[PDB]
Structure 1
Amino acid sequence: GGMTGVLFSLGASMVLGGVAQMLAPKARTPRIQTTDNGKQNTYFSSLDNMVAQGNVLPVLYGEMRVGSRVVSQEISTADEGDGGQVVVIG
C-alpha cells in the first residue's frame, strides 16, 4: 500500500475529442425535423403561442420579443361602454 503502481497517465486520451472541448464545454444543437422544413429553431427563441398543460413556465433575461403560453382564451359579446357617459350609438 505504500507504493502506487500503474500511474496510468491520461494525455491524448482526452484530447482525442478536440482541444477546444477541454477549455469550453461546447453547446447542444437542437434536433432537426422534416415537417418543420428548414426553420432551425434554437433553445432560446419562441415567436408563437404555446400551450400551458403540464409544462414549465419559461423565463426571460433580456430584450428579445417572445411569444407566451396561453392560459385562458374566450370570446363574448362586446358590450357598449367607455370610461364615461358618452354612449351614443347613432
Structure 2
Amino acid sequence: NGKQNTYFSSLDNMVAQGNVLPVLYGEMRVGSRVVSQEISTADEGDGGQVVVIG
C-alpha cells in the first residue's frame, strides 16, 4: 500500500568557481545555473523505527 519512494534521483551540478554571471539582454528563454542546492528529507512515515543516538 501507499506511495512508492520518489527520491530526486540525480541533480544537475553546482556552477564551479570562476564561471562569470551571465547577462541576459531582452526576452530569450534560459536554462538553470545552480548556486545553492540542498535536499532536506523529512519523515512522512509513522512511529520510531529511525532512532538516532548522540
- TM-score under structure 2 length normalisation: 0.42
- Measured after TM superposition, the shift of residue 68 of structure 1 is 3.1
Structure in which a larger fraction of residues adopt helix: 1
- Separation (CA, whole Å) in 1 of partners of 2:44 and 2:5: 43
- Checking the alignment, whether the CA contact within 8 Å between 1:49 and 1:67 is kept in structure 2 is no
Structure in which a larger fraction of residues adopt strand: 1
Q: Percent identity?
A: 100
- Measured after TM superposition, the shift of residue 54 of structure 1 is 1.4
Q: What is the aligned-residue RMSD (CA, Å)? A: 15.0
Structure 2 residue ranges without an equivalent (≥5): none
Offset from partner CA, 1:24-63 (integer Å, 9 cap, x none): xxxxxxxxxxxxx999999999999872421100000111
- Measured after TM superposition, the shift of residue 70 of structure 1 is 0.7
Which of 28, 34, 44 is 1:80 aligned to? 44
- Measured after TM superposition, the shift of residue 84 of structure 1 is 28
Q: How many residues align?
A: 54
- TM-score under structure 1 length normalisation: 0.28
Structure 1 residue ranges without an equivalent (≥5): 1-36
Q: Tell which has more relative contact order, 1 or 2 (C-alpha 8 A, sep 6+).
A: 2
